[PDB]
Amino acid sequence: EVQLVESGGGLIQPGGSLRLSCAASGLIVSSNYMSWVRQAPGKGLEWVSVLYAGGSTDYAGSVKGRFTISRDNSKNTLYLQMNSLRAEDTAVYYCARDAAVYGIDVWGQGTTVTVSSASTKGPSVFPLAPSSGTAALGCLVKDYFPEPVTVSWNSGALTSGVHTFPAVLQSSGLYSLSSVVTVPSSSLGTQTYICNVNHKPSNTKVDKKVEPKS
Amino acid sequence: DIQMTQSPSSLSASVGDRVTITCRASQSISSYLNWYQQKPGKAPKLLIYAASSLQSGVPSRFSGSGSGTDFTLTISSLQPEDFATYYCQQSYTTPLFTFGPGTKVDIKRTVAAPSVFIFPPSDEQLKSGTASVVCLLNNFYPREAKVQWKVDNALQSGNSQESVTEQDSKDSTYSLSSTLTLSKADYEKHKVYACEVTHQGLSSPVTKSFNRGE
Amino acid sequence: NLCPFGEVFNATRFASVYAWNRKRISNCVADYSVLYNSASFSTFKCYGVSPTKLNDLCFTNVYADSFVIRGDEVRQIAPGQTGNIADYNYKLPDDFTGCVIAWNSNNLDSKVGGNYNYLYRLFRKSNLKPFERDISTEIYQAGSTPCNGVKGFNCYFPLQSYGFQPTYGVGYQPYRVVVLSFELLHAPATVCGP
Ligand SMILES: *[C@@H]1O[C@H](CO)[C@@H](O[C@@H]2O[C@H](CO)[C@@H](O)[C@H](O)[C@H]2NC(C)=O)[C@H](O)[C@H]1NC(C)=O
Numbered sequence: 001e002v003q004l005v006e007s008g009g010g011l012i013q014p015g016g017s018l019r020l021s022c023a024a025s026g027l028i029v030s031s032n033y034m035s036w037v038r039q040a041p042g043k044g045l046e047w048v049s050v051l052y053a054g055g056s057t058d059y060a061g062s063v064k065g066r067f068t069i070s071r072d073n074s075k076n077t078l079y080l081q082m083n084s085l086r087a088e089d090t091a092v093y094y095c096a097r098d099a100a101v102y103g104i105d106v107w108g109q110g111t112t113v114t115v116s117s118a119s120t121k122g123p124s125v126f127p128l129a130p131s132s133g134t135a136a137l138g139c140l141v142k143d144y145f146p147e148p149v150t151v152s153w154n155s156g157a158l159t160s161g162v163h164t165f166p167a168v169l170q171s172s173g174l175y176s177l178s179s180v181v182t183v184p185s186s187s188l189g190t191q192t193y194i195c196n197v198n199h200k201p202s203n204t205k206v207d208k209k210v211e212p213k214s
Numbered sequence: 215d216i217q218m219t220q221s222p223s224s225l226s227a228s229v230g231d232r233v234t235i236t237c238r239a240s241q242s243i244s245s246y247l248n249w250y251q252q253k254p255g256k257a258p259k260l261l262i263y264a265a266s267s268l269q270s271g272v273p274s275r276f277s278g279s280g281s282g283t284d285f286t287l288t289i290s291s292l293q294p295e296d297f298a299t300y301y302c303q304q305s306y307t308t309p310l311f312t313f314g315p316g317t318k319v320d321i322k323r324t325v326a327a328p329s330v331f332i333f334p335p336s337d338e339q340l341k342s343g344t345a346s347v348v349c350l351l352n353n354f355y356p357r358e359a360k361v362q363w364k365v366d367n368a369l370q371s372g373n374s375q376e377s378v379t380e381q382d383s384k385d386s387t388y389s390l391s392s393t394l395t396l397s398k399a400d401y402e403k404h405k406v407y408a409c410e411v412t413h414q415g416l417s418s419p420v421t422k423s424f425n426r427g428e
Numbered sequence: 429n430l431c432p433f434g435e436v437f438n439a440t441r442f443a444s445v446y447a448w449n450r451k452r453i454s455n456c457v458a459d460y461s462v463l464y465n466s467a468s469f470s471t472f473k474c475y476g477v478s479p480t481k482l483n484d485l486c487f488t489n490v491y492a493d494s495f496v497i498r499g500d501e502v503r504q505i506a507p508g509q510t511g512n513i514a515d516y517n518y519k520l521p522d523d524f525t526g527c528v529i530a531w532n533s534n535n536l537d538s539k540v541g542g543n544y545n546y547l548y549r550l551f552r553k554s555n556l557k558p559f560e561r562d563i564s565t566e567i568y569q570a571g572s573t574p575c576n577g578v579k580g581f582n583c584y585f586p587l588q589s590y591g592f593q594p595t596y597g598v599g600y601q602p603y604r605v606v607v608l609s610f611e612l613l614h615a616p617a618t619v620c621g622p
Contacts, residue, residue, distance in 0.1 A: 027571050027582060031553055033309045045258065045301060045313040054555035056510035058310060094257055099570070100308040100550055101588055103248040103263035105581075110257055126336040128348055131424075136331040140346055140393075142339070163352070163389045165377040170395075177377065178391050180350055182329075214428075241600060244542065244591035270581065308512070308550065 002026035002106055004078075004095050009111035011146055012085055016115075022078035022095030022108055030073045033098035036080045038091040041169075050098065051078065063089070085115045118145040118173040122204030125197050128178060129213045130188055137210050138163075138180030139195035143172075144202075151179040152196040188212050216240050216304055220314040224357060226322040227292050235287040235317045237302030242282045246306040249278055249287045252299045252316075254380065261300070262287065297321060297381075320357070323386040327415030328354035332408075332422040335401065345401035347394040349409035349422070353387040356414060361392040364408040364423075370394060402426065431456035431619065433463065436492045442537070442604050444547040445495040445517045446587060447563050453490040455618040459483060469531050470603065471502055476525030477610060483621035485610075490619045491526075493518070493559075493607040496537055496546050498590060499599030502530045505607060516549045518607075521558035526609040534594055537602035543592030546602065551586040559609075 007021040020036070022029075029051075036048040049059040049069045057069055068081045078095050093113055097106040121144060128138035141149055144167075151164045164179040179195060189212065197206045217240040227233045237247065245265035250258040260269050262278030265285060275290040287300055302314040328351035335345040349361055357378065363370035374394045381388060392409070408423035431453045443449040460482035464472065472479065497505070497513055504514035507524040514520070520528075537543060551568035564586070567575040571582030579585050592602050 031570050035309060035311075044316050045303075047311055047313075050309045052309070052510075052512075052515060053551070053553050054515045056515055056555070058510075098305075098309045098311065099263075099584065101246060101264055101305050102584060103260040103269060103305070104250075104258070104303065104311070105260045105263070105269065107257040107259075124339070124342070126339045126346070128333040128350075129336065131331070131333075134329075136329070136350055136352060138333075138348075138350075140333075140336075140339075140348060142346060163379055165379060165389075165391045168375045168377050168393075170375070176393070178348060178393065180331075180352070180389070180391070182352060241597040242591070242593065242595060244593075 004097070004106060004108035006093065006095055006108040006111040009093065009113045011114045011116070014086055014115050014117055016085055018082045018085065018113060020080040020082065020093055020095075020111060020113070022080075024076050024078065027097055027106060028073075029071050029076055029078050033100060034069075034071070034078045035096050035098050035104070036067075036069060036078075037094045037096055038089075039094070040088075040091040045094075048093070049080065082113070085113075087115050087117075089113060090115050114146060116145065116173050120145050120201050121174065122199045122202035123149060123176075123197060123206070125195065125206045125208040127208060127210040128180060129210055132212070133185060134182050135185045135188060136180055136182050137193060138178055139197065139208055139210065140176075140178045141197050142176045143170075143174045144176065144199055145174050146201055147175055149175070149177065149197060149199045151177075151198075153179075153181055154192075154194055155196060158193070216243060216307060216312055218302055218304060218312055218314040220302060220317045222317055223315070224318045224320065226356060227319050228322045229292055229294055231292045231322075233289040233292045233296075233319060235300045235302075235319075237280070237285045237287070237314055239283050239304060239306075243304045243306035245281045246304055246308075247278075247280065247285050248303045248305060249276075250301040250303060251296075252301065258301065263305075292319070320381050321386045323355040325415040326353060326355045326387055327413055327420075328352055328359065328390070328411060330409065330411050330420050330422045332424060334407065334424055334426075340398050340401070343398050345396040345398055347396065347407055349392040349394070349411070351390040351392075351411055351413075353382075353385055353389055354413060354415065355385075355387045357381075357388050359390060359411060359413045361390070362410040362412075363392070363394045364406070364410060364421075366404045366406050367408075429456055431458045431490070433458065433492070436494055437463075437606060439494075440536075442494055442496045442533075444545075445497050445513060445605075446547055446549040448493050448495040448518055448561060451492040451494070453492055453619055458490075458619060458621060460621070463529070469529055471528065471530040473506065474527040475507060476523075477527070479527065482527075486617040486620040487610045488613045488615045488617040488619075489611050491607075491609040491611065493609070494605065496533065496590075496602050496604050497548070499532075499597075499601055499603050502603050502605065505530070505605055512548065512550060515555045516552040516562070517556070519556040519558045519560065520607070524558075524609070526607065529606045529608065530603045532601060533604040534596075534601040537604065538592040538594045538596065540594060542589075543602070544589045546590050546592055547587045548590065549586055550588045551584050
């Protein structure tokens, strides 16, 4: 039952505020070094701020004066107030028990915090058309915010050889991925290849049929 | 400030092998050094505390060694659920810990050169004013590969983005997409669009290309 | 007869920070310029008094606290500080009036392969009041179930050791500290200068 239960991430405009929460079982927060650590998309673990058992606080250079770590002994809960959020604060926020020499042995599940100025927008689906043994073809899912976007082919009856790439955040603040599949050259003029993009944040559901070009 | 460096950013291993991660501190931290495991999408999991002490409930095949500037995580017989990323973390400056960059252990395979495909921009995307050109590197091992874009033989630097897949459950290969963005106005003042891929399994660089009129 | 500052500064062994030593200087004369102008010191900040006017002053009792800490830790031996040493091992009052004198002691206090003699409290449940001194070696209870002298999960021995090897860094080597407090009460003042 030793458990840390994060809460309170989500999307936020730059300049805004979020209150992260970390409810604990099987340890007393009041009695522990409690840290918030963050992991940016693709990068590693950077320590953020800490709450000594006696109440002292320390913070990373980057967030000092924008974040305040507190607690409520009553609800046995660690808090992180995040103010004046910038784009770089986009990451996953773990709360964790620093048992110092004996390790950071107890971690929360994580909660994702996305800071962007981006209006949420459904993707465009363009055909990665096969050219003239085995042929490759796909879809390009461009210009979408926020993530996720799932992608299937032929409504589920095409799985073999499919590759749906992880998204990249473009310089416009919009994500964009592409999904490819390899199929017999022989089936190109015969069998129909359609990609099914779903983007639930914008209730966008697109099917695009990829065909050989003239 | 102590800086932690991890040596093999990625190393390959088969089940039952004897795997050795290393970590190195910028100053001597004695034995204040812990090891962590992270699988994609889950929280870290403490493996070794105090350089050598096994954490509770962690399989006996895990072992730590080192005292000063250099340390070693050893997996005695690598097991299938051990494919992960392993981080070191110093507890010398408790409670302001700093982490390693990580070592990722993936599944060893025989070498396989990528199948390379290039994809012009759809005629539809060109209506909206932007040209995406996609290069695909399909089903290669190992993860390390280089993709160079050439427009009319002129190498392209600041306008391409890559994305790589997770290691296939079945192939144990990777695939990689590179997407070269261009204005329609630019795209149309050049003829030859080429993708040069170099990789351990190819003798010399492989180059796929197309001219802008078919 | 003059004050036993030799007995404190030039002593062979120094206490661990968690169990800092306090010597009571009383009924004697002092030369605080043979200390200020020794030019053998790494840090010599005074507070609420000035080091060159110190030999013109009298006090009713002078307190000389002494201990050993890491270099990056000499900063917390100051009024208004927070961190493991100032929170859990040695706190100075916000109204502190006295002097904090450190020097580098790597020569005598770091031993090849570790000096596991010098300790500090790493786990505590509340911050120290100024000039408090917690020598309790109880197992620290970090959970809701008691520990009963058994080290284990949620149950940490509360004192760690500095490595203290001569091949350490700089603000990570052993410094010796001496905190001179100057108290003035409604009582005969017996620590003056010439
Ligand atoms: C600590 O010990 C040194 C000697 O090892 C003392 O230094 C000498 O003090 C006398 C009078 O001040 C001088 O004549 C010498 O030149 C000093 N030698 C050095 C190297 O400084 C020092 O005074 C002692 N400190 C205390 C507080 O007793």
